[PDB]
Design a protein around this ligand. Structure first.
Ligand SMILES: NS(=O)(=O)c1nc2ccc(O)cc2s1
Ligand SMILES: NS(=O)(=O)c1nc2ccc(O)cc2s1
Ligand SMILES: [Zn+2]
Length: 256
């Protein structure tokens, strides 16, 4: 029963998920002046050529494009990561207005939306075991700003009509998530958590510096989704972002 409303939103989560007030919670503000270049970072490798997308799901909190993760078909390696992380899903967070919607912020700037590509460390065998580990997951975060359309996003946008309400899914095969990346893979990285309950502190965050542009019409279609289930009173799925959490004893490192 957690959500994003006044009565079940981020200010309330701590009562059922006490780790919400933990030492390595996400998202955070990225202070570009305090982040330091780390020449120890190895090159980042996004290897999505054999990605196998399967389905898209409205889960009541966002929509997930889900992948076949039964083999190393789409993986992330390099950068701050030790070993191989397998893509399992991506999703977005967005706002009611273009001036908010991202989870991470950059010098307190909020972007219109934020894409999360979620990966688990194959040394733990499956996602559920991975989220019992401090290095279990890697989430690649990409900011969205409103301007020119992102062509590679349009197939996502056009299927949303078919998953308007909580619990609905659709087939979503043969989608190439490489079409959602910016040109540059310059990033910031820090240790953090899942940004929704259970808020587990199991994530290496890799947040790209370069945003992607999407069109107003594309994000407007995100905002037509529903948090509610079919037949229920309409609650638009908007402002499904957690605000920035205390950085505590952490350092944000830059790859550039
Ligand atoms: N702590 S949490 O998981 O954010 C919440 N759970 C409920 C359950 C009922 C309810 O009426 C409100 C909340 S907030
Ligand atoms: N926004 S985020 O940090 O990418 C995520 N949060 C959850 C929560 C549960 C879950 O099962 C998967 C994720 S990914
Ligand atoms: Zn997310």
């Amino acid at each position: 029963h957690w959500g994003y409303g006044k009565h079940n939103g981020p200010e309330h989560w701590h009562k059922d998920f006490p780790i919400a007030k933990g030492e390595r919670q996400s998202p955070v503000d990225i202070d570009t002046h305090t982040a330091k270049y780390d020449p120890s970072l190895k090159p980042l490798s996004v290897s999505y050529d054999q990605a196998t997308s399967l389905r898209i799901l409205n889960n009541g909190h966002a929509f997930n494009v889900e992948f076949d993760d039964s083999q190393d078909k789409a993986v992330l390696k390099g950068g701050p990561l030790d070993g191989t992380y397998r893509l399992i899903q991506f999703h977005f967070h967005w706002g009611s207005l273009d001036g908010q919607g991202s989870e991470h912020t950059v010098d307190k700037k909020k972007y219109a939306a934020e894409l999360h590509l979620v990966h688990w460390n194959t040394k733990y065998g499956d996602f559920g075991k991975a989220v019992q580990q401090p290095d279990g997951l890697a989430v690649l975060g990409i900011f969205l700003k409103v301007g020119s359309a992102k062509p590679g996003l349009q197939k996502v946008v056009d299927v949303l009509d078919s998953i308007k309400t909580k619990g609905k899914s659709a087939d979503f095969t043969n989608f190439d998530p490489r079409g959602l990346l910016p040109e540059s893979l310059d990033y910031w990285t820090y240790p953090g958590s899942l940004t929704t309950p259970p808020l587990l502190e199991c994530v290496t965050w890799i947040v790209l510096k370069e945003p992607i542009s999407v069109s107003s019409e594309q994000v407007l279609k995100f905002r037509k989704l529903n948090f509610n289930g079919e037949g229920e009173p309409e609650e638009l799925m908007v402002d499904n972002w957690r605000p920035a959490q205390p950085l505590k004893n952490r350092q944000i490192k830059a790859s550039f």
